[PDB]
């Protein structure tokens, strides 16, 4: 007996289903670490990350909400992106789009 215990049924949850995704190779050319969040517009991450910004347009990381991918200096790795939904209107970040798309 454990007060307030859960009895989670076994299995898994498939996240962001039925949405376009793409894989991109990213490399941190900065001398300092960079950590990117689950919902940050990837195309506008720190300029030190070298990748095809053009492909990651309107995309975010395909990772469970609230988690992140860290890039230590000089780190290179392939990440999977998932396309924004809703109105697909990007506002904020580095101010590169500030509108629909």
């Amino acid at each position: 007996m454990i007060p307030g215990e859960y009895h989670v049924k076994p299995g898994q949850i498939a996240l962001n289903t039925g949405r376009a995704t793409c894989r991109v190779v990213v490399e941190n050319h900065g001398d300092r670490p960079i950590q990117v969040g689950s919902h940050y517009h990837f195309a506008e991450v720190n300029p030190a990350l070298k990748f095809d910004r053009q492909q990651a347009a309107g995309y975010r990381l395909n990772i469970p909400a609230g988690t992140a991918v860290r890039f230590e200096p000089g780190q290179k790795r392939e990440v999977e992106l998932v396309a924004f939904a809703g109105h697909r209107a990007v506002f904020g970040f580095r101010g590169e789009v500030m509108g629909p798309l």
């Binding site: 007060p3 949850i13 990772i63």
Partner: protein, 566 residues
Amino acid sequence: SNISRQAYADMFGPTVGDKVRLADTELWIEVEDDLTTYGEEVKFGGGKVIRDGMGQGQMLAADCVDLVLTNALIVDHWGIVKADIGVKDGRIFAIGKAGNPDIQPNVTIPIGAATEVIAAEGKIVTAGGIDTHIHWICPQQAEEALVSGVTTMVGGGTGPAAGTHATTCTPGPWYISRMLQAADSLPVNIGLLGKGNVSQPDALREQVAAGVIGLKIAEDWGATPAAIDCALTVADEMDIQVALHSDTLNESGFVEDTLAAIGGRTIHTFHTEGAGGGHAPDIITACAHPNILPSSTNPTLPYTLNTIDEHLDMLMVCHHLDPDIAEDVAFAESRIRRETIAAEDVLHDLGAFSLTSSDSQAMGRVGEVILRTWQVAHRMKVQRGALAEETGDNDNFRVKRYIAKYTINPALTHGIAHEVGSIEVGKLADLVVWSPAFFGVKPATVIKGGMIAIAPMGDINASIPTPQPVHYRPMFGALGSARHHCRLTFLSQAAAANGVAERLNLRSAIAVVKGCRTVQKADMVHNSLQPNITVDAQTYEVRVDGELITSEPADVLPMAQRYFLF
């Protein structure tokens, strides 16, 4: 991508199909539905989702909610679902999917710059309790009640005076006016009951016009057929509720005579089992009628080993009786019957008893209405198993039946369900956040009108709010004007019309009671059973359709010694 269900629960709280044990009881609830879109859940913190342009949008204040409770496991009479809760203007705005419509799908609760966030992932959210049997013996009762999760308090009294010790009555215009002004200082919604024991209608009408939302008929002031009929006549013409504490001494007639006096008119029977008052030994038979809204006071809930022993002296002190006067002791003894005490638990489980209340410091414990209601649920599951209405391998239905007893049912009974009582859009945001391990015992957060009013708080000079000693302390929602704005003082339609609020210069928000005459047993959510119940005059045995109703006294209960320091 993919995430295992266990890791998922650890981050966002349980989802569809997962079960959670309520505190240390034997009750398990199962998430019936989850309103989120997997992978699109909103979470707050450094580097999380709720950030500009991401899970938070560019909308103005009028277009987003003021407060969002993220990933909340809602437990209410209508369901046990996982969802986000949006609060706007101190009222419940929506129950759905919170986020930024700009980049997220199915967002029904928009989060903007003007939105505050309360993280409910892994927590259980319920509406604020409603105690309709308060004796205003001391102002300190409000904080005790609020800490336990009760956000609305109905009753009467003028302080520690003989009359209030025994009955829930704020006698007359002057005291009613005084108590209405004093209510602005308390962090809970309040509604007053006047003294309904009079055979002159005008003496009652004055009290109703002064502001009371109901009239209390207590035997200590004479609960005779004439008094009862008089109160019901005024109640009928002013749309207010009547609370009854019948004639235990059978001085003016038996229970059937009282029932005759009522004449099929709507009425709320207090402590229907009888220990706290009522015709000996069969007041419990009132629960069989369609116009009676029956409730229990808490000391007899649930039936335990020490229940009886504790009752005699409690009753003497409450009602100002004398142990050196034989008739006074026989009066007390005639009210305490093991037979009806045991039946009461079962009748609650069947839905024959529709409400639970305290009877604060007058044969009741103000901070134990929620706690005892769940103790009864536990003991009944242990003794009678699943209810005929259960579906699935959980206690979801029994949970819905019991939570309604101190939330929506008390609200329907007193005509305030239009403002409080449940988590439904448009209702005042009186919510209580619980951690599954302390459900029904110690709340994590108590929200009044959209502002946290009391919560556990650690060392004030600490680097974070968690270090010891952690004990309940008043928050901003309980301070001066912020409080006035976040609480409601319930008036009668007449008092509202007369401009009582303006004359007394009340500072809090005003709510008006309505629909007190039209509610009947059938309207009590999950508790509308009208059983063919009988009580043996000699043995006091309770029978429903001839079968014997009874239960066994508990020696140990959950939500007891594992949580309290004393």
